[PDB]
Design a binder for this molecule. Structure first.
Ligand SMILES: OC[C@H]1O[C@@H](O)[C@H](O)[C@@H](O)[C@H]1O
Ligand SMILES: OC[C@H]1O[C@@H](O)[C@H](O)[C@@H](O)[C@H]1O
Lengths: 520, 104, 104, 520
């Protein structure tokens, strides 16, 4: 039986590699404070202040906290990630299992200047999950507060809030208010534990690999095509340029002219920014020259955007302005931090099937030619989907989000998150948690007013999340060696992906998932 | 078994709409003080003071407290009330169930 | 048996709301004339007249008539539409049944 | 099988007297025209015209007609009514059965000045009943259009319309519009017939009898009461009038002073009008001096009012202004018709238990007496219900309504109709009937506008309604002969309740139901 003197569960961290399954598990220690003094609060930002019309919001901030495991580094050690990306073409989640156990609840009081903390054995916590997705789904927005990458850290559970329809800072009629105490939840004292299971809906394998062929080179280099193209519209070698239509079969000599079955993926352009500083223009174009989408009178920066190659061949230094995910190095400020602090991810590997983010999709004609008028060809900056078009989804990273919730809507086109991940119509239910309020002593004479004086309190405990991943084994006849993800051979001041002198864990670089090759 | 380290019950708030029944439930947190220093006390108001003959009373005030759920807003959210009054000609209570748990 | 002196069917208009189904029914009285004096006729419009190139067409007009129930207001009273849109997230048709009767 | 050449049903008129049941049946021939040219029409009356605020209405008039059998004379011959009221204390309906059969439908056309009528064999009619009471219930308002009293007459089915909430002539938001084609109905050609059954809900017997005792005389005339009353407050026979309280037992000498268990029924006063003209005041008090009730800013005359005796002993000539039902003699105009045309009903028999309509209910004190102040007793014009109070319902008549629909409401007090009848929560369903419209020839080129041109048409047929009545047999030990309803012995120009020289049936007088006596 449960009690104050017996542990609720055990610590578990493993990666179990068996066949095509890998079961990763993680346990952490968390601390859940008391938010908003147990109050729901309207929060809003209007254009009245220095804010612009784009940054306005209306919403509510609750007392409730929530768990976010949505980042990969929670479920994989850098070595477990290395086994994954080196040996395997694809992986997708199957089922997860989630546990709260070993709950301590502690009341803290202030006496003069001295602080003291003591167990409260009879206090509870409230934990429910939204299984039916009846709440704003706050995960998948790439917010902070995930379980730490490194198992020895204790983390703080983030506060739960949500945004709703607004006009300016004011609320419209369709604005919703959700009281989270209005769901059924389970109340746990120090001997109780919480668990539930979840099973992912069938989702296409994330493809971890690069194509060994570019999309336009799928041809045979040896043989000509039996198809013809229009090579020359003008009489060649003659003293007069009188036009004549001349046709040719494309072949190894001109491959750019061959007929092709397929087209590159869709293109929505980005601005090009060079890491070398003297090359970039002198001005601030970050917001002005940005690639934005205009929704309901608010210009929203497009980030990261559709999956598009970062740069073409032999340009390392250029990157799309908003196009790439950007991770900070350990201990990076939140405002105007220098380039050296961020870690820019880059897509090299989708250059084959996808257009470069910073260049035009192609060129089309702007006019109908005549003997009088010359042909004029316009550039295509933005290109939607066309039949016979293929593309790769953005690469997942060890620091990046695992999944996102496909919004519930009439229609969607290739519903996969632009941050990368697994688009899910029913993602893992988000788990809400709160400290049940304990009143401070009420007055001796009745008063209707609600009790505003509470015991300062917080709770800590252990959380385990165990995900079962399905693997797609690499089977390939390639003769020569693959590229692998390998740690540096040369000596270092301190080990990568390990604690420093002071005890601070750090991840040196983002690790993309695609080192393997396939035939396109 | 019960103990200091195990919760007595769980939080429940719902409205279950099924057929001709709607089961509404509510959970709250309460605080019960000590009234009258544990004393029964005669209380009365006479016309001797500024009171009139209409406002006089005689009675007792106990230490005991009591629960009053008798108002509708306790059992219905404003949305649950909207489903009720828009879609339905009449409603009457059938049965109730009442619980105290998680006593500190 | 059928005859000149017995009705073919009965008038029906209802909305039956049961669970997740709503069965709406409608009955009307129609009058079908004789079109084109029983002739198929080529009909066309050229750019020769004041018409432009966008408005040109070629087709045939038959004697036949046809029933069109394709608008919602045929199958729902404004009250039945109100029950629908207020209480429900979505609706889709399942099956329909169609009748001609009482032909004069 | 049905067909154009075979009759749908047979003529039936009977009264079957068996035991405690009497089954009365009636068949009539009806003619149903085409109302409103097959249109629903808003109808309203505002105060803008000569109308006052009391007479304003808003409603709809439909094409549909309806059957009204709600008057007794439909179901009883004057002889069958005589067997009923003479031999029986009470009667209540049990079940009814209703039939349409032998339907002819005829189209009439105009050519120059000559009219011609010819069968239309293929045309239909639409007949439904509202079983669930989902329509305004228009019966019980004592409208015209009932089946004739005399079986040989052909009658015209009245049009159906209804009234709804209004403010002035304008409609408010809660105003309802009912489309009658929106119910399921049965469509009948000339070989089809319509029938349904109905079973009355259990209802208290209408009490047909008079009390042989007045309410205050229930005492024993021989014996004194052991109770005392205050006979005299002042010293009697003394030279000084110094007050002294003196008590006495009431007895045969003073009966008015005895203690009594019961009180007369409630009283809501009426104005007194004398048939002798010189006695009435000279003015028009009909509307001004009337007894009205004020509902939502509209003064509505109280008619007939609560059941109250018409007049006290040895006053024949006085009657309450609005208090009594008033029936017209055969061939009486609708406007300002002379006294000699109407037939005034009178309640003699409820004088025992009920107060006189034209006199005060009683007298109560207006002040608290003192040696200084004399006692002052005020009159009670209106008296609601008090405990220990008994009354009789208004008498049903051969011409009067059988039942009314108890409105659906939170509460009611003794729900019996003030016109007299059987208050029913679910009265007989009202039967609606209409000619299915047949279009005149539509144009040869399509037009969206609805077809406004129809074939002029009407239908006729036979209708049978059969009600099973339950009787309460008279069992009494009374020695001397009862009063009976007897026809006049002396010679007459023409028989009463029979056709005259010209063929016109007439009912000479209203026949009340209570000739029998009981002990109160
Ligand atoms: O001044 C530059 C700024 O312009 C604003 O419109 C925007 O909110 C900021 O993100 C930044 O772009
Ligand atoms: O002038 C006499 C009239 O007064 C009106 O108020 C009323 O509508 C009529 O019924 C009649 O009483």
């Amino acid at each position: 039986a449960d009690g104050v003197g017996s542990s609720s569960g055990n610590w578990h961290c493993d990666s179990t590699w068996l066949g095509d399954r890998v079961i990763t598990t993680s346990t952490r220690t968390w601390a859940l404070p008391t938010y908003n003094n147990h109050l729901y609060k309207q929060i809003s930002n209007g254009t009245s202040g220095g804010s612009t019309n784009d940054n306005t919001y209306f919403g509510y901030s609750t007392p409730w906290g929530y768990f976010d495991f949505n980042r990969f580094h929670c479920h994989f050690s850098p070595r477990d990630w290395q086994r994954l990306i080196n040996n395997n073409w694809g992986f997708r989640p199957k089922r997860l299992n989630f546990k709260l156990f070993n709950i301590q609840v502690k009341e803290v009081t202030q006496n003069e200047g001295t602080k003291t903390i003591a167990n409260n054995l009879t206090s509870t916590i409230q934990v429910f999950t939204d299984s039916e997705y009846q709440l704003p789904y706050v995960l998948g927005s790439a917010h902070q507060g995930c379980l730490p990458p490194f198992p020895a850290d204790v983390f703080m559970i983030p506060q739960y809030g949500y945004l709703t329809l607004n006009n300016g800072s004011q609320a419209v009629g369709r604005s919703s208010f959700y009281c989270l105490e209005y769901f059924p939840s389970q109340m746990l004292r120090t001997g109780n534990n919480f668990e539930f299971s979840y099973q992912f809906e069938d989702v296409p394998f994330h493809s971890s690999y690069a194509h060994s062929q570019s999309l336009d080179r799928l041809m045979n280099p040896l043989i000509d095509q039996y198809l013809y193209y229009l090579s020359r519209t003008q009489s060649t070698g003659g003293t007069a340029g009188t036009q004549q239509l001349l046709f040719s079969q494309a072949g190894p000599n001109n491959m750019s002219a061959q007929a092709k079955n397929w087209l590159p993926g869709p293109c929505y352009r980005q601005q090009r920014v060079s890491t070398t500083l003297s090359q970039n223009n002198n001005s601030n174009f970050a917001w002005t020259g940005a690639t934005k989408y205009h929704l309901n009178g608010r210009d929203s920066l497009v980030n990261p955007g559709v999956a598009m190659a970062t740069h073409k061949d032999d340009e390392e230094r250029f990157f799309p302005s908003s196009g790439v995910l950007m991770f900070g190095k350990q201990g990076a400020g939140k405002d105007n931090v220098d380039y050296s602090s961020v870690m820019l991810t880059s897509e090299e590997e989708i250059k084959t099937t996808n257009p470069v983010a910073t260049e035009q999709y192609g060129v089309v004609a702007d006019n109908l030619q005549q003997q009088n008028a010359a042909p004029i060809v316009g550039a295509v900056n933005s290109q939607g989907a066309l039949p016979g078009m293929v593309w790769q989804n953005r690469d997942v990273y060890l620091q990046g989000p695992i999944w996102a919730k496909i919004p519930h809507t009439d229609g969607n086109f290739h519903p996969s998150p632009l941050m990368g991940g697994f688009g899910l119509k029913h993602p893992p239910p988000q788990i809400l948690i709160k400290n049940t309020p304990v009143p401070a002593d009420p007055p001796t004479t009745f008063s209707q007013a609600k009790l505003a004086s509470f015991i300062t309190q917080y709770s800590t405990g252990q959380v385990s999340v165990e995900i079962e991943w399905e693997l797609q084994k690499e089977n390939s006849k390639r003769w020569n060696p693959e590229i692998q993800y390998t740690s540096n051979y040369y000596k270092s001041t301190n080990v990568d992906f390990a604690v420093n002198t002071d005890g601070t864990y750090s991840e040196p670089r983002p690790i993309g998932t695609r080192y393997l090759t396939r035939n396109l």
